[PDB]
């Protein structure tokens, strides 16, 4: 486990993100913190980003949840976020699945892409999803 000083620092950060002190980061509190930073986040994207680290799916961030987010975030560059953003750049249709013609389109900016698609389709569903993308990336 982390040392007492690190735990105290992360708990101070959590209390900064948790005004009422109930131990969970409500999406309203995250929204008001983000608005305090000059940003204007909509409810949809705020809920989407709050469930990115949501292991238990309760809709709130408890202390281990925020601690895992920090462990992913204290580094200078977050590889997982960059992979996710590359995937979001890829899927123009926005359906969350990147198709073979779409890969062909993004490679122009034939056998190699076919081999990549074949080796990326672990589940054999005929398309490439986010999990396949992160498996290929790692």
């Amino acid at each position: 486990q982390l040392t007492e000083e690190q735990i105290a620092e992360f708990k101070e950060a959590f209390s900064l993100f948790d005004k009422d002190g109930d131990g969970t980061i409500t999406t309203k509190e995250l929204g008001t913190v983000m608005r305090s930073l000059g940003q204007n986040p909509t409810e949809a994207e705020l809920q989407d980003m709050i469930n990115e680290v949501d292991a238990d799916g309760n809709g709130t961030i408890d202390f281990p949840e925020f601690l895992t987010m920090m462990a992913r975030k204290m580094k200078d560059t977050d590889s997982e976020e960059e992979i996710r953003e590359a995937f979001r750049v890829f899927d123009k249709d926005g359906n969350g699945y990147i198709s073979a013609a779409e890969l062909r389109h993004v490679m122009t900016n034939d056998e190699e892409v076919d081999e990549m698609i074949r080796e990326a389709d672990i589940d054999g569903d005929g398309q490439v999803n986010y999990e396949e993308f992160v498996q290929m990336m790692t």
Binding site: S79, E82, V89, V106, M116, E119, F133, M136, M137
Partner: protein, 359 residues
């Protein structure tokens, strides 16, 4: 009703006398420049040519003082019409008395005909060796004749349409704008600030370089600062505040002019670099197009950077499946560079998104 006819008739009389005061004011300056330059080598101060040209300056001074008196007499009549008074004495305020006498004093300084001389003793530059000469007194009066250039400011003010238009006077009245000589100068610095600061700089560049040359010729036997192109270089480097080099005035006239050059050269330099800075900035419409084009470029660069992220990711995985070590590590190293370059293009794109939203 009748006041409008009288005011507009005195406006054209004042404007006509301002032009004639400029014609004779600048004629005296032109003849003074010719007489000063010619009396150095072409003839002497006791020659009949010196008396003839200095009598031309004196005659033009009498006419200029006549037109200054008559112009200020039209200002009295204009004052009486504007303020409803019928007696000229009411207009004669202490401020007006001082400025009428000040303009007469400024315009009455000229090289009076006849040769008078005074002993000029100056400490030479870079050697501190005193040098004395019997300079004529007409150099103490030729230089102040450049104060007649204030008549240019009067001619420009009386000729500007913003000062003599019925539409401008009515519109400015609704906003209570004070129409004077300062307003015309402020508007000239918004329409054409570069032209105003260039016709001003490249005109007093020759006026000051000639003043330094005409003053530092009695105390300059080595042709250092008495040279016209030497004094033009001196005045320019002092204007830009670079320094003096070997060209330091040997007289307090050249030191004084190099002081006014350095004063107006600390302001005009700042105003010119603040104007060329407002002409290299994109307008509101041009910046919208530029940020629109950079958004398209960054959108394409994100596609190519993310494509590099995925291309190198598959190279890492394919080489890992091939049990390679050196090739897999090289593409793993390339994968981190592709991810870092993808993060950089994403951050600089969002720097643009915040920029378009700010305005």
């Amino acid at each position: 009703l009748g006041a409008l006819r009288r005011r507009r008739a005195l406006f054209e009389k004042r404007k006509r006398l301002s032009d004639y005061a400029l014609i004779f004011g600048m004629f005296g300056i032109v003849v003074m420049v010719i007489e000063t330059e010619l009396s150095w080598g072409a003839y002497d101060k006791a020659s009949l040519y010196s008396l003839a040209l200095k009598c031309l300056i004196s005659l033009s001074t009498i006419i200029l003082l006549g037109l200054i008196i008559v112009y200020h007499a039209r200002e009295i009549q204009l004052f009486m019409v504007d303020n409803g008074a019928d007696d000229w004495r009411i207009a004669m305020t202490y401020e007006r008395i001082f400025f009428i006498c000040l303009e007469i004093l400024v315009c009455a300084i000229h090289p009076i005909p006849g040769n008078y001389t005074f002993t000029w003793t100056a400490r030479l530059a870079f050697s501190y060796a005193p040098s004395t000469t019997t300079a004529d007194v007409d150099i103490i009066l030729s230089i102040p004749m450049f104060l007649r250039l204030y008549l240019i400011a009067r001619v420009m003010l009386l000729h500007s349409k913003l000062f003599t238009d019925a539409s401008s006077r009515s519109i400015g009245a609704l906003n209570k704008i004070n129409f004077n000589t300062r307003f015309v100068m402020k508007t000239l610095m918004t329409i054409c600030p570069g032209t105003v600061l260039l016709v001003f700089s490249i005109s007093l560049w020759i006026i000051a370089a000639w003043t330094v040359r005409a003053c530092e010729r009695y105390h300059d036997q080595q042709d250092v600062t008495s040279n016209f192109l030497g004094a033009m270089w001196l005045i320019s480097i002092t204007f830009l505040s670079i320094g003096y080099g070997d060209m330091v005035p040997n007289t307090y006239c050249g030191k004084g002019v190099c002081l006014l050059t350095g004063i107006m050269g600390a302001g005009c330099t700042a105003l010119v670099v603040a104007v060329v800075a407002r002409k290299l900035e994109l307008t509101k419409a041009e910046k919208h197009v530029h940020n629109f084009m950079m958004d398209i470029q960054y959108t394409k660069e994100m596609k190519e950077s993310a494509a590099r992220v995925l291309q190198e990711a598959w190279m890492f995985y394919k080489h890992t499946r091939r049990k390679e070590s050196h090739a897999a590590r090289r593409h793993q190293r390339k994968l981190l560079a592709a991810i870092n370059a993808f993060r950089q293009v994403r951050l600089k794109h969002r720097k643009l998104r915040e920029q378009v939203n700010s305005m």
